[PDB]
Coordinates of all heavy atoms in Angstrom, one line a residue:
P1 N 0.8 -1.2 0.0 CA 0.0 0.0 0.0 C 0.9 1.3 0.0 O 2.1 1.2 0.3 CB -0.8 -0.1 1.3 CG 0.1 -0.9 2.2 CD 0.8 -1.9 1.3
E2 N 0.2 2.4 -0.4 CA 1.0 3.6 -0.5 C 1.2 4.3 0.9 O 0.6 5.3 1.2 CB 0.2 4.6 -1.4 CG 0.1 4.1 -2.9 CD 1.5 4.1 -3.6 OE1 2.3 4.9 -3.2 OE2 1.7 3.2 -4.4
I3 N 2.0 3.6 1.7 CA 2.4 4.1 3.0 C 3.9 4.1 3.1 O 4.5 3.1 2.8 CB 1.7 3.2 4.1 CG1 0.2 3.3 4.0 CG2 2.1 3.7 5.5 CD1 -0.5 2.3 4.9
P4 N 4.5 5.2 3.6 CA 6.0 5.2 3.8 C 6.4 4.3 4.9 O 6.0 4.5 6.1 CB 6.3 6.6 4.0 CG 5.1 7.4 3.5 CD 3.9 6.5 3.7
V5 N 7.3 3.3 4.7 CA 7.8 2.4 5.7 C 9.3 2.4 5.6 O 9.8 2.2 4.5 CB 7.2 1.0 5.5 CG1 7.8 0.1 6.6 CG2 5.7 1.0 5.6
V6 N 10.0 2.6 6.7 CA 11.4 2.4 6.8 C 11.6 0.9 7.1 O 11.1 0.4 8.1 CB 12.0 3.3 7.9 CG1 13.5 3.1 7.9 CG2 11.7 4.7 7.7
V7 N 12.4 0.3 6.3 CA 12.8 -1.2 6.4 C 14.3 -1.3 6.6 O 15.0 -0.8 5.8 CB 12.3 -2.0 5.2 CG1 12.5 -3.5 5.5 CG2 10.8 -1.7 4.9
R8 N 14.7 -1.9 7.7 CA 16.1 -2.2 7.9 C 16.4 -3.7 7.7 O 15.8 -4.5 8.4 CB 16.5 -1.8 9.3 CG 16.5 -0.3 9.6 CD 16.9 0.1 11.0 NE 16.8 1.5 11.2 CZ 17.1 2.1 12.3 NH1 17.4 1.4 13.4 NH2 17.0 3.4 12.4
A9 N 17.2 -4.0 6.8 CA 17.5 -5.4 6.4 C 19.0 -5.5 6.1 O 19.7 -4.6 5.7 CB 16.6 -5.8 5.2
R10 N 19.5 -6.8 6.2 CA 20.8 -7.1 5.8 C 20.9 -7.2 4.3 O 21.9 -6.8 3.7 CB 21.3 -8.4 6.4 CG 21.7 -8.3 7.9 CD 22.0 -9.6 8.4 NE 22.7 -9.6 9.7 CZ 23.0 -10.6 10.4 NH1 22.6 -11.8 10.1 NH2 23.7 -10.5 11.6
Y11 N 19.9 -7.8 3.6 CA 19.9 -8.0 2.2 C 18.6 -7.5 1.7 O 17.6 -7.4 2.4 CB 20.1 -9.4 1.8 CG 21.3 -10.1 2.2 CD1 21.3 -10.8 3.4 CD2 22.5 -10.1 1.5 CE1 22.5 -11.4 3.9 CE2 23.6 -10.7 1.9 CZ 23.6 -11.4 3.1 OH 24.8 -12.0 3.6
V12 N 18.5 -7.1 0.4 CA 17.3 -6.7 -0.3 C 17.4 -7.0 -1.7 O 18.5 -7.0 -2.3 CB 17.0 -5.1 0.0 CG1 18.1 -4.3 -0.7 CG2 15.6 -4.7 -0.5
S13 N 16.3 -7.4 -2.3 CA 16.2 -7.6 -3.8 C 15.9 -6.3 -4.5 O 15.3 -5.3 -3.8 CB 15.2 -8.7 -4.1 OG 13.9 -8.3 -3.9
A14 N 16.2 -6.2 -5.7 CA 16.0 -4.9 -6.5 C 14.5 -4.6 -6.6 O 14.1 -3.4 -6.5 CB 16.6 -5.1 -7.9
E15 N 13.7 -5.6 -6.9 CA 12.2 -5.4 -7.0 C 11.6 -4.9 -5.7 O 10.7 -4.1 -5.6 CB 11.5 -6.6 -7.6 CG 12.1 -7.2 -8.9 CD 13.4 -7.9 -8.7 OE1 13.9 -8.2 -7.6 OE2 14.0 -8.3 -9.8
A16 N 12.1 -5.5 -4.6 CA 11.6 -5.2 -3.3 C 11.9 -3.7 -2.9 O 11.1 -3.0 -2.4 CB 12.1 -6.1 -2.2
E17 N 13.2 -3.3 -3.2 CA 13.6 -2.0 -2.9 C 12.8 -1.0 -3.8 O 12.4 0.1 -3.4 CB 15.1 -1.8 -3.2 CG 15.6 -0.4 -2.8 CD 17.0 -0.2 -3.0 OE1 17.7 -1.2 -3.4 OE2 17.6 0.9 -2.7
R18 N 12.6 -1.4 -5.1 CA 11.8 -0.5 -6.0 C 10.4 -0.3 -5.6 O 9.8 0.8 -5.6 CB 11.9 -1.1 -7.4 CG 11.5 -0.2 -8.5 CD 10.1 -0.6 -9.0 NE 10.1 -2.0 -9.4 CZ 9.0 -2.7 -9.7 NH1 7.8 -2.2 -9.5 NH2 9.1 -4.0 -10.0
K19 N 9.8 -1.4 -5.1 CA 8.4 -1.3 -4.6 C 8.3 -0.5 -3.3 O 7.3 0.2 -3.2 CB 7.8 -2.7 -4.5 CG 7.6 -3.4 -5.9 CD 7.1 -4.9 -5.7 CE 7.0 -5.6 -7.0 NZ 6.5 -7.0 -6.8
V20 N 9.2 -0.7 -2.5 CA 9.3 0.2 -1.2 C 9.4 1.6 -1.6 O 8.7 2.5 -1.1 CB 10.4 -0.3 -0.3 CG1 10.7 0.8 0.7 CG2 10.0 -1.6 0.4
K21 N 10.3 1.9 -2.6 CA 10.5 3.3 -3.0 C 9.2 3.9 -3.7 O 8.9 5.1 -3.5 CB 11.6 3.4 -4.0 CG 13.0 3.4 -3.3 CD 14.1 3.7 -4.2 CE 15.5 3.3 -3.6 NZ 15.6 3.6 -2.2
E22 N 8.5 3.1 -4.4 CA 7.2 3.5 -4.9 C 6.2 3.7 -3.8 O 5.4 4.7 -3.9 CB 6.6 2.5 -5.9 CG 7.4 2.3 -7.2 CD 6.7 1.4 -8.2 OE1 5.4 1.2 -8.0 OE2 7.3 0.8 -9.1
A23 N 6.2 2.9 -2.8 CA 5.3 3.1 -1.6 C 5.7 4.4 -0.8 O 4.9 4.9 0.0 CB 5.3 1.9 -0.7
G24 N 6.9 4.9 -1.0 CA 7.4 6.1 -0.4 C 8.3 5.9 0.8 O 8.6 6.9 1.4
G25 N 8.7 4.7 1.0 CA 9.7 4.5 2.1 C 11.1 4.3 1.6 O 11.5 4.7 0.5
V26 N 11.9 3.8 2.5 CA 13.3 3.6 2.3 C 13.7 2.2 2.8 O 13.2 1.7 3.8 CB 14.2 4.7 2.9 CG1 14.1 4.7 4.4 CG2 15.6 4.7 2.5
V27 N 14.7 1.6 2.1 CA 15.3 0.4 2.6 C 16.7 0.7 3.2 O 17.6 1.2 2.4 CB 15.5 -0.7 1.5 CG1 16.2 -1.9 2.0 CG2 14.1 -1.1 1.0
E28 N 16.9 0.5 4.5 CA 18.2 0.8 5.1 C 19.0 -0.5 5.3 O 18.4 -1.5 5.6 CB 18.0 1.5 6.5 CG 17.4 2.9 6.4 CD 17.8 3.7 7.6 OE1 17.5 3.3 8.7 OE2 18.5 4.7 7.4
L29 N 20.3 -0.4 5.0 CA 21.1 -1.6 5.1 C 21.8 -1.6 6.5 O 22.4 -0.7 6.9 CB 22.2 -1.6 4.0 CG 21.6 -1.8 2.6 CD1 22.8 -1.7 1.6 CD2 20.9 -3.2 2.5
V30 N 21.7 -2.8 7.1 CA 22.3 -3.0 8.4 C 23.2 -4.3 8.3 O 23.2 -5.0 7.3 CB 21.3 -3.2 9.6 CG1 20.5 -1.9 9.7 CG2 20.4 -4.3 9.2
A31 N 23.9 -4.6 9.4 CA 24.7 -5.8 9.5 C 24.4 -6.5 10.8 O 25.0 -7.6 11.1 CB 26.2 -5.4 9.5

């Protein structure tokens, strides 16, 4: 859904990051 969500993950796929960016959030990389 069109809701901004901050997601912290070790790995991310390109389509998942793209769909998060369309929803208006960000994918943050952690270790």
Side-chain angles (χ1 to χ4, degrees):
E2 294 293 328
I3 300 172
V5 178
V6 182
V7 185
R8 293 180 181 177
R10 283 172 165 177
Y11 303 91
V12 66
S13 69
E15 307 71 11
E17 183 178 1
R18 195 254 304 167
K19 290 175 185 183
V20 163
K21 283 189 196 317
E22 298 185 19
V26 65
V27 174
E28 292 209 299
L29 291 178
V30 295

